[PDB]
Amino acid sequence: SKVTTVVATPGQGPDRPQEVSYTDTKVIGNGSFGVVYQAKLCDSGELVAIKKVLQDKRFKNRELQIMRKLDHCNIVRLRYFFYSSGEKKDEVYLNLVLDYVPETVYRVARHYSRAKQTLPVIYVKLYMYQLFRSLAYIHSFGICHRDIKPQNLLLDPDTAVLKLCDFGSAKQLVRGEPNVSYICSRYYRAPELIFGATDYTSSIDVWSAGCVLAELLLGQPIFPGDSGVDQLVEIIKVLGTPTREQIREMNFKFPQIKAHPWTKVFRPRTPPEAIALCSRLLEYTPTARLTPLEACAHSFFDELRDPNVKLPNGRDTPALFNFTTQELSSNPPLATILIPPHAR
Amino acid sequence: SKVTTVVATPGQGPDRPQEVSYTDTKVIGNGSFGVVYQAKLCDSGELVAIKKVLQDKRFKNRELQIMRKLDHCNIVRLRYFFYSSKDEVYLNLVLDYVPETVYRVARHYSRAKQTLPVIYVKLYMYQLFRSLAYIHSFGICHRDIKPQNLLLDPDTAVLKLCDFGSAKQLVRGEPNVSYICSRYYRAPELIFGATDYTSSIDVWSAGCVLAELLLGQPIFPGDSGVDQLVEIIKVLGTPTREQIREMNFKFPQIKAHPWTKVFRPRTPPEAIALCSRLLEYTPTARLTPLEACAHSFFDELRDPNVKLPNGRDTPALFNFTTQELSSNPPLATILIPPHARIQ
Numbered sequence: 001s002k003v004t005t006v007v008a009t010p011g012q013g014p015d016r017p018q019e020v021s022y023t024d025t026k027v028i029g030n031g032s033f034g035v036v037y038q039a040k041l042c043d044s045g046e047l048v049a050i051k052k053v054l055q056d057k058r059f060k061n062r063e064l065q066i067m068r069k070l071d072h073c074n075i076v077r078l079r080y081f082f083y084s085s086g087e088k089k090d091e092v093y094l095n096l097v098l099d100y101v102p103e104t105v106y107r108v109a110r111h112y113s114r115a116k117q118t119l120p121v122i123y124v125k126l127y128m129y130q131l132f133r134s135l136a137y138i139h140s141f142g143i144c145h146r147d148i149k150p151q152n153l154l155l156d157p158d159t160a161v162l163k164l165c166d167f168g169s170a171k172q173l174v175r176g177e178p179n180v181s182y183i184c185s186r187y188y189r190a191p192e193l194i195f196g197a198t199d200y201t202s203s204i205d206v207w208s209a210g211c212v213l214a215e216l217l218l219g220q221p222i223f224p225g226d227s228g229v230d231q232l233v234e235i236i237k238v239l240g241t242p243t244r245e246q247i248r249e250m251n252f253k254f255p256q257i258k259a260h261p262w263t264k265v266f267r268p269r270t271p272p273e274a275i276a277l278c279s280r281l282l283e284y285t286p287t288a289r290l291t292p293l294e295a296c297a298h299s300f301f302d303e304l305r306d307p308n309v310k311l312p313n314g315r316d317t318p319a320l321f322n323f324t325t326q327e328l329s330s331n332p333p334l335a336t337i338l339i340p341p342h343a344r
Numbered sequence: 345s346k347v348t349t350v351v352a353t354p355g356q357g358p359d360r361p362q363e364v365s366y367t368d369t370k371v372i373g374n375g376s377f378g379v380v381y382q383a384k385l386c387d388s389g390e391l392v393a394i395k396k397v398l399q400d401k402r403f404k405n406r407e408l409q410i411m412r413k414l415d416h417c418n419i420v421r422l423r424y425f426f427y428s429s430k431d432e433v434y435l436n437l438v439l440d441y442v443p444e445t446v447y448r449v450a451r452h453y454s455r456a457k458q459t460l461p462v463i464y465v466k467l468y469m470y471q472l473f474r475s476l477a478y479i480h481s482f483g484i485c486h487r488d489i490k491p492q493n494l495l496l497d498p499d500t501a502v503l504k505l506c507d508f509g510s511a512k513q514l515v516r517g518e519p520n521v522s523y524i525c526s527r528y529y530r531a532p533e534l535i536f537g538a539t540d541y542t543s544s545i546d547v548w549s550a551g552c553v554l555a556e557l558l559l560g561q562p563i564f565p566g567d568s569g570v571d572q573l574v575e576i577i578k579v580l581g582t583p584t585r586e587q588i589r590e591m592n593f594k595f596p597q598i599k600a601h602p603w604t605k606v607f608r609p610r611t612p613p614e615a616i617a618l619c620s621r622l623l624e625y626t627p628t629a630r631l632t633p634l635e636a637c638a639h640s641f642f643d644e645l646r647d648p649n650v651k652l653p654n655g656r657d658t659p660a661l662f663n664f665t666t667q668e669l670s671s672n673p674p675l676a677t678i679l680i681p682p683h684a685r686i687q
């Protein structure tokens with residue numbers, strides 16, 4: 001087959017480029033951002049995904065700057081990056097060489113959905129815990145993801161490892177500076193984003209994470225809608241009509257619906273700790289939502305802290321407990337809960 | 345067979361209650377609004393659509409108060425309306441049933457690697473600009489324009505605008521929620537969260553329908569506001585600081601992609617022209633509904649010879665009221681062709 005050789009910069013190291021050669025190139029992905037290729041590195045034989053984007057040249061790439069800062073077992077690794085022009089008007093492209101990961105939570109959820117099965121609660125636990133860890137970490141640097149949705153949660157089905165990807169909307173949120181309210185994909189947008197607020201916090205990611213939890217339990221999206229009006233009605237149908245207090249803390253012709261009791265929303269064989277968790281992730285008032293770390297520590301995740309827990313495929317669980325000081329900074333006293341007696 | 349009989353108020357005219365009996369009740373639609381039943385009237389055998397909705401005890405239903413003032417050949421007729429019954433009260437809207445929708449028609453053609461013949465595009469788009477010219481005449485904005493909300497009669501080629509659930513009168517200086525309109529058909533001012541938007545949002549949406557029927561697929565798709573604005577910039581070029589001012593800030597600098605690359609080879613120039621004039625960053629730089637009716641793309645409809653493919657007459661395109669033309673009366677001299685003046 002054909003071989004490409006580029007001079008590429010490692011993501012973690014100090015700016016010291018080396019000759020990286022790769023082969024078996026194929027398209028996998030399209031969209032606003034640009035294209036994603038898959039390839040095999042010639043030296044290692046490891047598979048990589050290459051996200052090719054257009055570069056301003058005017059300003060430096062915010063995705064690239066944020067990803068160089070990040071090192072976490074539950075976030076896709078940037079191995080290298082390199083520039084190519086190919087054949088556009090002296091147009092320049094930034095190529096991000098990332099880890100290849102052979103599945104996504106979107107693809108998996110949909111296999112169980114179009115089989116009228118429900119994803120076994122154990123996986124729901126493994127995947128939602130590793131997401132909340134990845135948020136705990138990036139929230140500690142004040143970085144908000146702003147795009148949290150199933151398509152952006154990579155899985156290795158053999159190791160049960162989840163890896164957060166797609167930092168193209170990610171931004172550090174400084175209290176008092178405003179931010180655009182038109183980020184986050186439809187279905188997972190926080191009510192304050194729908195109401196057009198520009199003084200929102202990292203809590204938008206917690207609401208999005210809650211919408212992923214509900215969807216893995218129900219086997220389909222919980223707040224669907226082609227418009228915001230449609231979206232708000234599906235929310236008010238579950239949380240009821242926000243009070244004057246609650247509206248004021250988000251950002252006015254609202255129908256009076258009594259709150260549908262939470263236990264009546266999910267199928268009946270659904271664990272009540274999974275429901276408690278939802279009620280505490282999907283709150284109208286952003287400041288009343290759990291923190292990523294507060295979530296990791298919820299009784300819903302207790303099975304993962306059992307010393308005998310094993311994967312359905314018979315392998316051990318992946319890293320769940322190797323917390324850093326950084327990751328715990330939000331609230332260190334929780335370490336006594338997050339790190340169980342048996343853990344190294 | 346089963347038979348429901350109610351006492352209904354008429355939608356148009358004065359308040360003289362009437363007995364209405366229908367049968368073959370069937371569900372045809374579910375969603376946030378409530379339920380849409382099809383039914384067959386006992387006496388006439390005519391098909392109707394009943395839209396059942398939760399009635400606030402607080403204030404009277406706005407969709408109702410609006411639809412009762414509306415009488416136009418390109419807007420679904422409200423035949424009757426009644427209150428009924430969860431242990432609280434529902435508002436029902438008895439409306440003409442119309443057997444097709446642009447959504448369905450667009451899709452039948454789309455997955456058969458086919459575009460809809462341009463003649464139907466002209467007919468359907470023309471009748472839509474007429475309906476907007478009418479409601480805008482009253483300062484009422486629809487705020488939902490999308491293919492699913494455009495009813496069709498495949499045989500007559502009559503298009504009817506439905507769903508006045510988001511519709512509202514826009515007074516200047518009064519603000520309005522920016523979270524109305526359906527993904528794909530939202531004007532950039534709504535994506536940017538603006539609350540001083542005018543009826544020109546309806547014109548942007550209409551323009552997305554035009555472009556979609558021509559292209560065979562939506563033109564500005566994406567799961568997020570951001571993804572949409574990228575598809576918009578890949579076609580219109582980068583908004584200038586003045587353009588952004590007129591809607592109300594770190595955008596990828598990209599050149600305006602010539603509008604003729606956008607459409608398949610043999611697309612009418614005049615179709616492409618009308619798009620560039622509906623899909624403008626600057627809300628006030630967009631054609632009014634009535635100005636679009638009079639665009640050269642619609643010239644073929646004004647031809648006295650014009651026939652539908654099945655050999656039938658086109659429907660009523662020229663019977664304009666004073667109410668309809670108040671946006672700009674002089675336009676009557678293009679809108680009403682010579683052959684429609686003949687006594």
Ligand SMILES: c1ccc(CNc2nc(Nc3cc(C4CC4)n[nH]3)c3sccc3n2)cc1
Nearest residue numbers: 028029036049098099100101102103151165
């Ligand atoms: C969002 C949009 C596009 C993509 C690329 N599509 C994709 N990526 C995969 N893996 C992937 C992407 C990446 C880098 C872009 C993050 N690493 N690994 C896999 S595994 C089975 C289907 C599939 N589709 C991923 C997320």
Ligand SMILES: c1ccc(CNc2nc(Nc3cc(C4CC4)n[nH]3)c3sccc3n2)cc1
Nearest residue numbers: 372373380393439440441442443444492506
């Ligand atoms: C918007 C919302 C709900 C619907 C109901 N679904 C529906 N309605 C139709 N016609 C319809 C609706 C109406 C009034 C409720 C608006 N009149 N005629 C037709 S004809 C072929 C499929 C179909 N589906 C239509 C548009």
Ligand SMILES: [Cl-]
Nearest residue numbers: 104106107151
């Ligand atoms: Cl995916």
Ligand SMILES: [Cl-]
Nearest residue numbers: 033051165166
């Ligand atoms: Cl991506």
Ligand SMILES: [Cl-]
Nearest residue numbers: 445447448492
């Ligand atoms: Cl439809």
Ligand SMILES: [Cl-]
Nearest residue numbers: 449460464498
């Ligand atoms: Cl047709």
Ligand SMILES: [Cl-]
Nearest residue numbers: 377395506507
């Ligand atoms: Cl409707």
Ligand SMILES: [Cl-]
Nearest residue numbers: 648681682683
């Ligand atoms: Cl003539």
